[PDB]
Structure formats: C-alpha cells, structure tokens
Design an enzyme around this catalytic site. Structure first.
Site, PDB file in Angstrom:
ATOM      1  N   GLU A  11      18.806  85.498 -17.899  1.00 33.76           N
ATOM      2  CA  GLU A  11      19.502  85.604 -16.639  1.00 33.76           C
ATOM      3  C   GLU A  11      20.013  87.001 -16.292  1.00 33.76           C
ATOM      4  OE1 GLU A  11      19.835  83.116 -14.719  1.00 33.76           O
ATOM      5  OE2 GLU A  11      19.307  81.354 -15.888  1.00 33.76           O
ATOM      6  N   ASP A  20      19.679  84.498  -6.287  1.00 34.86           N
ATOM      7  CA  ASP A  20      18.838  84.114  -7.386  1.00 34.86           C
ATOM      8  C   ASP A  20      17.381  84.048  -6.964  1.00 34.86           C
ATOM      9  OD1 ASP A  20      18.486  81.577  -6.397  1.00 34.86           O
ATOM     10  OD2 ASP A  20      19.472  80.525  -7.999  1.00 34.86           O
TER      11      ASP A  20
END
Ligand SMILES: [Cl-]
Ligand SMILES: [Cl-]
Length: 162
Positions: A11, A20
């Site tokens: 991440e 994202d």
C-alpha cells in the site's frame, strides 16, 4: 517479514488524502476514507477518524495508528466470519498473512466471494488455488499486487516480497 511490513509494501504510505487505484479517497497506509466523490466528505471522515481538524494532512504517527487499527480489524473480521475463519484456521503463518492482506484490500465480503479458491486453500491444493485466484477482477485490476499475494499462497514463503 510480517503482515505489517507486507501491507506497507503493498500500500505505501501517503500523508495527504489521495485517490486509490479505484479512485477513492484514502490516506495513510491504504486507509479508505470514503467512496463518495466529495473531497469535502473525505476531509470530514478524516477528522472524525483522527479526532482533530486535519485539513487533509496527518502525521506518520497518525498514519500508523490507523494502520494498527485496520490490521486488527481485518484479523478480527476474519475470525468472526463463518466462511473465512475455517480457512484461516487451516493455514500456516505465512499463508494466514496472505489472507489478511486480501481482506484488508477488499473487505471480508469481497474475499468471502472467492468461494472456490477458499475451498482449494483449505484442501491445500496450492497450484490449483493460485490458478483460480487469478480468474478474478482483482487480479486483472491490480495484477502486480495480486501476483505477490498469489505466489505467497502458492509457495508459503515471503519470496515475492523479498
Ligand atoms: Cl476509523
Ligand atoms: Cl498492482
């Protein structure tokens, strides 16, 4: 290697609100804020998550705190899940981390949707689980991360992350 270092590789870390891979507002170590398209609705979820007026920026400590909470919830969520718990209980330490990773990314519902692959993990059919796991929107949308998680399931080692 551990779950925390594995997810931190998957991440990254960002200290300002960002979108994202799906276009959703996120911050920190993959902490989803909201699916709404509103940035303001995102800053508000953020303040509420942090307990201060952040103005869309957080510190490294604040990011790690959300991260600890999120890993914990992902684990507790798997243990509370009638479909996931048995799989998890059946796996060794490394593969358990691969499953926490999928749940952290796509939520418990999403993962519980990998019915056939879960059954194969449970039977310890590694090669066949890996082939099935790959036939998914997940793999086609985030192929490099999927491959890492899949290889972790296939081999039972951290090789993909080293
Ligand atoms: Cl929260
Ligand atoms: Cl990817």
């Amino acid at each position: 290697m551990n779950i925390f270092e594995m997810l931190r590789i998957d991440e990254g870390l960002r200290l300002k609100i960002y979108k994202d891979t799906e276009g959703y507002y996120t911050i920190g170590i993959g902490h989803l804020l909201t699916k709404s398209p509103s940035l303001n609705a995102a800053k508000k979820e953020l303040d509420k998550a942090i307990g201060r007026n952040t103005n869309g920026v957080i510190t490294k400590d604040e990011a790690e705190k959300l991260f600890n909470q999120d890993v914990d919830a992902a684990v507790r969520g798997i243990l509370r899940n009638a479909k996931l718990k048995p799989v998890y209980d059946s796996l060794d330490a490394v593969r358990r981390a691969a499953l926490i990773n999928m749940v952290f990314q796509m939520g418990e519902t999403g993962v519980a949707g990998f019915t056939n692959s879960l059954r194969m993990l449970q039977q310890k059919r590694w090669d066949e689980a890996a082939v099935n796991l790959a036939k998914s929107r997940w793999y086609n949308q985030t192929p490099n991360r999927a491959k890492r998680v899949i290889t972790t399931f296939r081999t039972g080692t951290w090789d993909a992350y080293k």
